[PDB]
C-alpha positions as a printed Julia matrix, in Angstrom:
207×3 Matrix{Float64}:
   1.94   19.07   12.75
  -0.18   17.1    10.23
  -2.56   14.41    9.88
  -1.73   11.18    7.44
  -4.79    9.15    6.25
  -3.18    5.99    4.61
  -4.72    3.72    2.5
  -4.29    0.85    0.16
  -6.17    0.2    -3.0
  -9.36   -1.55   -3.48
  -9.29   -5.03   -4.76
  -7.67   -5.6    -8.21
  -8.63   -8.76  -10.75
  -5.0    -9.76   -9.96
  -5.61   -9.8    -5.66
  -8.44  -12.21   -6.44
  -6.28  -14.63   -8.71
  -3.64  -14.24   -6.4
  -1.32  -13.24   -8.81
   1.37  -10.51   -8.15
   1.28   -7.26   -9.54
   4.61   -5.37   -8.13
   4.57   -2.2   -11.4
   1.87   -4.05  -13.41
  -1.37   -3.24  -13.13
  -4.97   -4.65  -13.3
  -8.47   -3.39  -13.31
 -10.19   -2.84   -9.91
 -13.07   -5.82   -9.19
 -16.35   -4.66   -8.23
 -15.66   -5.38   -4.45
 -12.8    -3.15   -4.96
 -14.66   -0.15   -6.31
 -17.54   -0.78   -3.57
 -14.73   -1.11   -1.06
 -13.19    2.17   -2.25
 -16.66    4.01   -2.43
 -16.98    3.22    1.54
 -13.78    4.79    2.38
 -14.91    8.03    0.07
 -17.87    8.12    2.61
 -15.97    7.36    5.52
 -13.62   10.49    4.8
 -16.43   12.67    3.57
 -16.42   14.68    6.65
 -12.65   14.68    6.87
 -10.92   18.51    5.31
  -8.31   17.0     3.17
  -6.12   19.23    1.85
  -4.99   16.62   -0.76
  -4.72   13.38   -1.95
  -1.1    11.32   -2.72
  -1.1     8.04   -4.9
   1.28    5.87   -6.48
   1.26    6.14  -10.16
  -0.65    2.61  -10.65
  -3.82    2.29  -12.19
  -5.47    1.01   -8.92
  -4.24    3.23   -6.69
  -5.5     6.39   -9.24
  -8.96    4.79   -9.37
  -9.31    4.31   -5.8
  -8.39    7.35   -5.43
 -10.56    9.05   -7.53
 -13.73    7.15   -6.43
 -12.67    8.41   -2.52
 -12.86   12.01   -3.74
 -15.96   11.38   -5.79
 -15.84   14.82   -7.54
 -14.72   16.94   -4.22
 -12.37   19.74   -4.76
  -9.04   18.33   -3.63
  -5.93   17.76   -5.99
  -4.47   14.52   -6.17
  -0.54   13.95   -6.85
   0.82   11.33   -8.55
   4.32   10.02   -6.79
   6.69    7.22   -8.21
   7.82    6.83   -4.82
   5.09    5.27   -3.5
   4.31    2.19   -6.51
   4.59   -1.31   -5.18
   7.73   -3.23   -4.36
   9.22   -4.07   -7.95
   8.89   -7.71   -8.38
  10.28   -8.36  -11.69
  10.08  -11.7   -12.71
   6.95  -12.6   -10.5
   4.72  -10.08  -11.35
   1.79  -11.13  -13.11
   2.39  -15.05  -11.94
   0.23  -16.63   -9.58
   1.94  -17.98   -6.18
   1.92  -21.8    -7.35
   4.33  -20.71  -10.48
   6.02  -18.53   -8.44
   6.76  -21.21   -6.01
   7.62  -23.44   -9.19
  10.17  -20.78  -10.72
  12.01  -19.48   -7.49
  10.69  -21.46   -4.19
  13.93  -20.42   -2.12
  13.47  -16.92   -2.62
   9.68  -17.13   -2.58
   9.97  -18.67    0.8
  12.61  -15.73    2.04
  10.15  -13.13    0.4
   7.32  -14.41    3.15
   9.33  -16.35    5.51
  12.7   -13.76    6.3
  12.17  -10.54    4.06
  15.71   -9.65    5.31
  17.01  -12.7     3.39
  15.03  -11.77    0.55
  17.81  -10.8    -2.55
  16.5   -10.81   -6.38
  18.67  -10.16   -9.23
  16.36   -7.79  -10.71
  13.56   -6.49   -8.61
  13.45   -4.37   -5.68
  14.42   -5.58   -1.67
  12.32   -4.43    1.15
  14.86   -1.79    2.02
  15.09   -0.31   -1.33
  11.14   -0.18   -0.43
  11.48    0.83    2.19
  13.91    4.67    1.46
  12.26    5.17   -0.78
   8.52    5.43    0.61
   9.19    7.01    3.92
  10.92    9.94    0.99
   7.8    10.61    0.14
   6.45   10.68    3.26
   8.48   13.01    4.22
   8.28   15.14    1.31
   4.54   14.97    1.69
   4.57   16.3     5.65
   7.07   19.25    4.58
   4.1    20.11    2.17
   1.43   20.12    4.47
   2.41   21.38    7.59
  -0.8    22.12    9.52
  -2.86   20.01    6.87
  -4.51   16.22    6.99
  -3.97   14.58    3.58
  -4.94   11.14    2.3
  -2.31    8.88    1.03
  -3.2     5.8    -1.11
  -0.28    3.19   -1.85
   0.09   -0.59   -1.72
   0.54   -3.69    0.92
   4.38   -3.86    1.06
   5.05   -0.26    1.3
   2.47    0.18    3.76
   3.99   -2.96    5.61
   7.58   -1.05    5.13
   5.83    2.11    6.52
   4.53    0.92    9.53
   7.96   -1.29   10.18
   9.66    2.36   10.26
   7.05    4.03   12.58
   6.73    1.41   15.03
  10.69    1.34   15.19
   9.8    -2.69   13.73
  13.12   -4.35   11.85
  12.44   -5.61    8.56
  12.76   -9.25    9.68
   9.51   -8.54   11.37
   7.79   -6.63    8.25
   4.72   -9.64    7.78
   3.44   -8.73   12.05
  -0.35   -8.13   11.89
  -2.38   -6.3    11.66
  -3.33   -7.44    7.66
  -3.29   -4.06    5.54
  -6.91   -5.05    3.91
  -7.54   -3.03    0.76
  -9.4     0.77    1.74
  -7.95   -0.29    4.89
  -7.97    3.33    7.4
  -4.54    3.75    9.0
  -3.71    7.39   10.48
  -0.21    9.1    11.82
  -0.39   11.83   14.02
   2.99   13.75   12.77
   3.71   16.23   15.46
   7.58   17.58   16.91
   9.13   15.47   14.46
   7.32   12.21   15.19
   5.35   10.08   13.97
   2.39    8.97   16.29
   0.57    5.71   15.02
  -3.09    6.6    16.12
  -5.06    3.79   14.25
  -3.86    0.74   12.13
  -5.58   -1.54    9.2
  -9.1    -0.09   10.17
 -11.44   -2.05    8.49
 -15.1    -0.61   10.03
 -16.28    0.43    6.44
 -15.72   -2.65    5.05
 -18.35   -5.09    4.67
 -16.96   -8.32    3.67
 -13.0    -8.21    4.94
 -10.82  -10.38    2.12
  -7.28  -12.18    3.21
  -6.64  -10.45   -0.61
C-alpha cells in the first residue's frame, strides 16, 4: 500500500525553444518556477514521506521549490533522467528533422520503430523507470511520496500501468510540466487514480 504523486518538471529555457534536452540540462523559465511553486501549494496539505527526482538540474529545482523548506528528504535517482537522446539533444526539431528525418519521424510517429545508434529506445526507458518505481514502493510501504521525472518516462510509465504497448506511448492525455498524476499501489497493483492534472496551472503550454 502506497500513494505515488508523479510529476514532471516545470518549464526549462530549452521546452520554450523547442529544443531537446534528453541528459542535458537548462535553467527553469519563470513560468516554470511559478508553475512549480503551484504544485508546492497544491501538495502542501499532502504528508509526504519523501521526494524522488531524476538527477537533472530541472527536475532538482522543481523539486526543491515544491518542498519550499518542508522537512522531507529528497533522493536523487539515475533511473529516472530523460530518455538519452544523444545526438539530438540540445537541437531544435527543424535541425533535428534536417539531420535524421526518418528516425525523427519513427521517434513521434511509431516509437516501436524508433532505433538510434547511440541513444536510448523507449524500452530501455522504459526497465529502467518502472526499477525505480519499484524500488521506490518497496521503500515506502504505507507512505505517499512525490516523484518528479520527465515527459517520456512518464509517457513510458503510464504505457506500463495502463497495460498500453509502446506503439501507443504518444495517447493523451499531454504530461504538461507540474502536471499531478497519482497511483494508488495496493496488492501488487498499480491503480491509476488521476492523470496529467493540470488544475494548478494557470496558463497550460503544449511545451
Amino acid at each position: 500500500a502506497t500513494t505515488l504523486y508523479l510529476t514532471r518538471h516545470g518549464e526549462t529555457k530549452w521546452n520554450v525553444e523547442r529544443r531537446m534536452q534528453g541528459w542535458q540540462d537548462s535553467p527553469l523559465t519563470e513560468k516554470g518556477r511559478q508553475d512549480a511553486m503551484r504544485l508546492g501549494k497544491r501538495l502542501e496539505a499532502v504528508e509526504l514521506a519523501a521526494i524522488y527526482t531524476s538527477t537533472s538540474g530541472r527536475a532538482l529545482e522543481t523539486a526543491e521549490i515544491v518542498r519550499g523548506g518542508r522537512l522531507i528528504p529528497i533522493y536523487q535517482d539515475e533511473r529516472l533522467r530523460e530518455i538519452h537522446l544523444g545526438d539530438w539533444e540540445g537541437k531544435t526539431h527543424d535541425e533535428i528533422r534536417q539531420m535524421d528525418p526518418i528516425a525523427f519521424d519513427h521517434f513521434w510517429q511509431a516509437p516501436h520503430l524508433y532505433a538510434p545508434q547511440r541513444g536510448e529506445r523507449f524500452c530501455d526507458v522504459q526497465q529502467r523507470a518502472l526499477e525505480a518505481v519499484q524500488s521506490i514502493v518497496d521503500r515506502h510501504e504505507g507512505e505517499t511520496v512525490l516523484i518528479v521525472t520527465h515527459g517520456v518516462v512518464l509517457k513510458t510509465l503510464m504505457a506500463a500501468f495502463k497495460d498500453t504497448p509502446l506503439d501507443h506511448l504518444w495517447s493523451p492525455p499531454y504530461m504538461y510540466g507540474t502536471s499531478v498524476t497519482i497511483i494508488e499501489v495496493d496488492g501488487g497493483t498499480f491503480h491509476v487514480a488521476v492523470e496529467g492534472d493540470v488544475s494548478h496551472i494557470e496558463e497550460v503550454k503544449e511545451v
